[PDB]
Amino acid sequence: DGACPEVKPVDNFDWSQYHGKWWQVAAYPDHITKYGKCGWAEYTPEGKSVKVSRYSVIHGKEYFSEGTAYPVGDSKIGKIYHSYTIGGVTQEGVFNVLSTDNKNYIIGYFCSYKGHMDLVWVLSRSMVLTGEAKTAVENYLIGSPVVDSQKLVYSDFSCK
Numbered sequence: 001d002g003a004c005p006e007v008k009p010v011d012n013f014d015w016s017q018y019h020g021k022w023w024q025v026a027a028y029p030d031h032i033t034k035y036g037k038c039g040w041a042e043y044t045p046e047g048k049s050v051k052v053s054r055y056s057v058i059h060g061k062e063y064f065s066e067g068t069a070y071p072v073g074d075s076k077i078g079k080i081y082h083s084y085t086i087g088g089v090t091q092e093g094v095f096n097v098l099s100t101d102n103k104n105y106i107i108g109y110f111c112s113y114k115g116h117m118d119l120v121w122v123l124s125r126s127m128v129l130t131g132e133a134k135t136a137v138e139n140y141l142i143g144s145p146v147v148d149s150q151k152l153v154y155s156d157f158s159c160k
């Protein structure tokens with residue numbers, strides 16, 4: 001209930017950090033049921049874009065999807081376009097980067113608007129957030145105006 005909040009994406013975004021495998025270590029349950037559990041993605045830079053190949057388990061079945069990602073505007077601001085193709089259907093959109101250390105983690109956020117639905121997912125280079133990345137992610141959630149830490153579900157890559 002309400003319109004989507006004034007999200008202020010980052011102003012320090014480094015695109016060169018996205019290559020190799022990133023694990024989805026946490027998200028909102030609406031995100032896990034719609035885009036899958038056990039989620040990981042391999043990014044492959046292709047000029048200005050990054051091509052995405054992602055694995056997840058959606059309604060008990062395994063899928064690969066594919067996508068392309070591009071920056072919108074000044075790449076430093078953390079507004080990201082992304083296409084998403086799975087089972088012969090393509091979707092596209094823009095999301096915003098809430099927080100990142102330009103090394104280990106990225107928190108992404110999307111909202112669609114008399115009500116609003118919000119989707120939050122957390123990617124990391126490691127299968128578990130430890131140490132540096134964890135303390136960063138927690139201090140962010142404490143001060144955050146739009147993310148409900150209580151609502152984040154953490155992945156257990158223990159999946160089939």
Ligand SMILES: C[C@]12CC[C@H](O)C[C@H]1CC[C@@H]1[C@@H]2CC[C@]2(C)[C@@H](C3=CC(=O)OC3)CC[C@]12O
Nearest residue numbers: 035041054082083084091092093094095110119
């Ligand atoms: C921006 C986006 C556009 C397509 C649909 O409108 C859903 C939104 C919110 C979710 C968002 C897609 C665009 C694709 C995504 C980044 C995709 C992911 C790739 C990844 O590494 O983590 C998630 C799953 C779904 C996704 O998280």
